[PDB]
Amino acid sequence: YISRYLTDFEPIQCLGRGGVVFEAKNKVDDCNYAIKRIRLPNRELAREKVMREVKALAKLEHPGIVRYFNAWLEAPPEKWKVYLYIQMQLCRKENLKDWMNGRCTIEERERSVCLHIFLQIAEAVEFLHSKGLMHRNLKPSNIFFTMDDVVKVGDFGLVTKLYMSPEQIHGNSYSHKVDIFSLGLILFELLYPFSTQMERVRTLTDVRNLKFPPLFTQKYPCEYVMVQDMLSPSPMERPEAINIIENAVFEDL
Ligand SMILES: Cc1cc(NC(=O)[C@H](O)c2cccc(F)c2)ccc1-c1cn(C)c2ncnc(N)c12
């Protein structure tokens, strides 16, 4: 037995860890892809549950969704069981976190470029919600850029907490509102740069509890009302993905 992945791609490196994610140039077409290797569940309703998802995911086409290419199953003989591969468009190694941690002044955070980036993330989330799907992984380490500076939501589907909503932590991610919450923090962190890791944690932890820096509440007064809405502590209160994109602040960017 020889595995499909090993014959057809020469691996470059590992990009992710949690399933594993590799970089690998396909030999036929000579382009480098992001490849997610999941070890599958051993049960026969846990297997089939997943395989109904890869079917629904592979149908997704949107500008904020990393471009899909292929999926295939393998089952090799271990030396001492059944891995699923997903070939996805490779993305720039510099994610949203990197981008933010490299621009720490109000000046390097232009109000125009920031709202632009955020809208794309919001529009991608609108799409997924309208398809009856939810992200549940919105956070800067997992918001990406394409070679051509297009923003993409990161990995989701196929089954830190500072960007998780409360219910998500102690509950069952119950509603698609958990994504509205995540967007709130992300919008703030874009418009209010940090100096130190401590500052970031202390201030986000506070903004989870609606304790905002007054300098922010002054500087961006509209944005403040949005981030408040998006954080409304009773889930059912928060806006819908659609409502956020239709907010006045997004007009003639
Ligand atoms: C591994 C990975 C997977 C996805 N999967 C999906 O969106 C989503 O599962 C999906 C599947 C199928 C169709 C469909 F529409 C959507 C998105 C992003 C990355 C990614 C992570 N890391 C660390 C990366 N590093 C460089 N490039 C990268 N693509 C990545």
Author numbering: 585 to 602, 605 to 666, 881 to 959, 987 to 1080
Text of the article:
Hydroxyl substitution on this group was found to increase potency by 2-3-fold (13 vs. 14) with preference for the (R)-over the (S)-enantiomer (11 vs. 12). Compound 11 formed three hydrogen bonds directly with the carbonyl of Q889, the amide of C891, and the carbonyl of F956 from PERK, respectively. In addition, compound 11 forms two hydrogen bonds with a water molecule, and this molecule hydrogen bonds to the amide of V652. In the ATP binding hinge region, substitution at the C2-position (R1) of the pyrrolopyrimidine ring appeared feasible, filling a small pocket near C891. Compounds 11 and 24 were screened in the DiscoverX scanMAXSM panel of 468 kinases. The resulting TREEspotTM interaction maps revealed that the methyl substituent in 24 led to superior selectivity versus 11. The S(35), S(10), and S(1) selectivity scores at a concentration of 1 µM were 0.005, 0, and 0 for 24 versus 0.072, 0.035, and 0 for 11. Given the superior selectivity of 24 but slight loss in potency versus 11, further optimization of the series was carried out with the 2-methyl substitution on the pyrrolopyrimidine ring to further improve potency and drug-like properties.
